[PDB]
Design a protein around this ligand. Sequence first.
Ligand code: VO4
Length: 282
Amino acid sequence: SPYGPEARAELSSRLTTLRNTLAPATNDPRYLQACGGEKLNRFRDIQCRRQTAVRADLNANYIQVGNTRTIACQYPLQSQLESHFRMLAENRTPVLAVLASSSEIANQRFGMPDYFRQSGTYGSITVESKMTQQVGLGDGIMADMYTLTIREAGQKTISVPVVHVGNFPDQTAVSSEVTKALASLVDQTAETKRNMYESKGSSAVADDSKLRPVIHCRAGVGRTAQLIGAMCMNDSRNSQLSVEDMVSQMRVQRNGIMVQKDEQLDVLIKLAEGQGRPLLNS
Ligand code: VO4
């Protein structure tokens, strides 16, 4: 009963209603509008909740699912790179997880700058990329890791660990097993980096808005949301948080598309079932 087709249909029904309610109107007060002149949204129908927006010129949101705090964003546009790097630095980002594949990034029609595998200067910010480890996730899926060192006069220099799933199967969903392995890697990477900041006595440890994992694919609503859901299920503090809760929270805090595909919701359901975690509220 709890994970049967009836329960799953009811979950989908509730989530579909929510998506409709959250659909953006013209000049919607709930969503971030360009401020302005440059393109803000990579996709016109995939918008950034205003009240949880990280920066006025980025499509990026603070998200809290149960107790788990992250930032979900779109792949930054070329014009957004300086702002994106400043976001990463100010957040003392303990991990940046990029779920757009190498094939997607290499497709120049998609306008996705190769900002983390190359070094460069973006306005006042200079970034150095270094290759680190490579971790297999299962099914031949590989996480390539980097460190991004972000330098800017007047700012403390920040190094950001990057987890890039270079061969993400961008046509299809990754399995629950691969998702689990990825969530574990991303969480572990973040824990190691956060610990460094704690050991140095960083003031960012006491700030709700900082030390958040940053996760994006192309739009930051599909693969991104699947990973965030898996990360929240890894969090010891989230007992009894339902799948309905998780997805509703992602949607209200970013946009109604979070967990874009039924295929992605299937993975979250499987992970929840493995834990005896409820699908529905009440
Ligand atoms: O600006 V701090 O890395 O001392 O929180």
